[PDB]
Amino acid sequence: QAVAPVYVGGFLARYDQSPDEAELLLPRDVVEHWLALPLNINHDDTAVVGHVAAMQSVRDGLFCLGCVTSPRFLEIVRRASEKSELVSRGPVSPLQPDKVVEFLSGSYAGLSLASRFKHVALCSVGRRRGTLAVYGRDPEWVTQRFPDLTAADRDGLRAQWQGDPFRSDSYGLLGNSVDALYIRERLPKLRYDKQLVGVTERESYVKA
Amino acid sequence: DEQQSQAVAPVYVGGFLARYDQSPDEAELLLPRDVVEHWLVALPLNINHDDTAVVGHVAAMQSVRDGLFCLGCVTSPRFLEIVRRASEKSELVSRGPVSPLQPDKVVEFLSGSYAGLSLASPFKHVALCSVGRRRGTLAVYGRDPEWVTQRFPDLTAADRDGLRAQWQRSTAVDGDPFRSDSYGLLGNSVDALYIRERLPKLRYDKQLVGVTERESYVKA
């Protein structure tokens, strides 16, 4: 079923990266000290789509695994996915087509941690670099998309992930999508994030 | 309801569909002046060439010194309502237009989403898209047809008279010609996020037609 659960994984912060703003800084020690969070869209608290199923502080940073479960949001996404050229082109060679997963990959390619832990936002592109969002139906498959993770890192994550809270609508998502078009260097940042975490379009649903 | 009424009033869109001064790399985009004049029942106005997404009609078309210029009119109640609700949830629109211009959520959202124009095919119709394949095809939105044409420096008073004579003239297009929904526009919006060099092309188009100067609702 298309409207079945969707897992999203990726880094909320890369220690090896120097944030441009003194606000984005997120040291390891301060993170390992703090280390279920709601998962939303673009930080709008009226757009909760699921929850964070796991968080693990690793070598290169803070890795996060989330699960999109809102029936209202998955249905809106399903409908929109049927009317999208990007999605009709499908994924790369081996990967089987998954409209909902592909629409989510194209739309919210970034991950953003809110704590200006309050919650993780799915967004057009994260403000911190290396925050690529990877979507999939199977949590194991998702975590295996990141080379930086070790079997030990994955075991810590597996133990964790192992009414409808979305109070928004298609109109809200649409207005948000137009904003996405004016975020400068969006794609370059995404490509940079992709390169940094070693994820490739030739082995995932990443559109960037 | 009264303000929401004004927001869903008709919106005019104007711009070049082709520029005689621009040589396209792809032969399929060739549209020389002579062919345009010979070729030149209102044509429908749709979103990215989708027949289920007709939002209005072309009010006028005219070949001028610099290219093929057209004036369209967005009339679809259902389409305008979708745009209205979405525009209320846009940070882009919330920032607003440049100073003297009155804020206009619907016009600004359209300016942001469908910044380009695209001719279809002798003339089948005109489509609103995020960015056109032909350079110089920037879309300019406004509530007044006259104001819209006054946005283009290349147009002379004589050019505007000819255009005016056309749009001042009920079409076999406009109940509601829109046969899609917010989901369809959402599906289309994600596609727009991966068009290469979207903004650069838009800015190139903006400078080409001189709209850069003339204050307008253009977001690029």
Swiss-Prot record, chain A:
<protein>
    <recommendedName>
        <fullName>Assemblin</fullName>
    </recommendedName>
</protein>
<feature type="active site" description="Charge relay system">
    <location>
        <position position="112"/>
    </location>
</feature>
<comment type="function">
    <text>Protease that plays an essential role in virion assembly within the nucleus. Catalyzes the cleavage of the assembly protein after formation of the spherical procapsid. By that cleavage, the capsid matures and gains its icosahedral shape. The cleavage sites seem to include -Ala-Ser-, -Ala-Ala-, as well as Ala-Thr bonds. Assemblin and cleavages products are evicted from the capsid before or during DNA packaging.</text>
</comment>
<feature type="active site" description="Charge relay system">
    <location>
        <position position="119"/>
    </location>
</feature>
<comment type="subunit">
    <text>Exists in a monomer-dimer equilibrium with the dimer being the active species.</text>
</comment>
<feature type="active site" description="Charge relay system">
    <location>
        <position position="43"/>
    </location>
</feature>
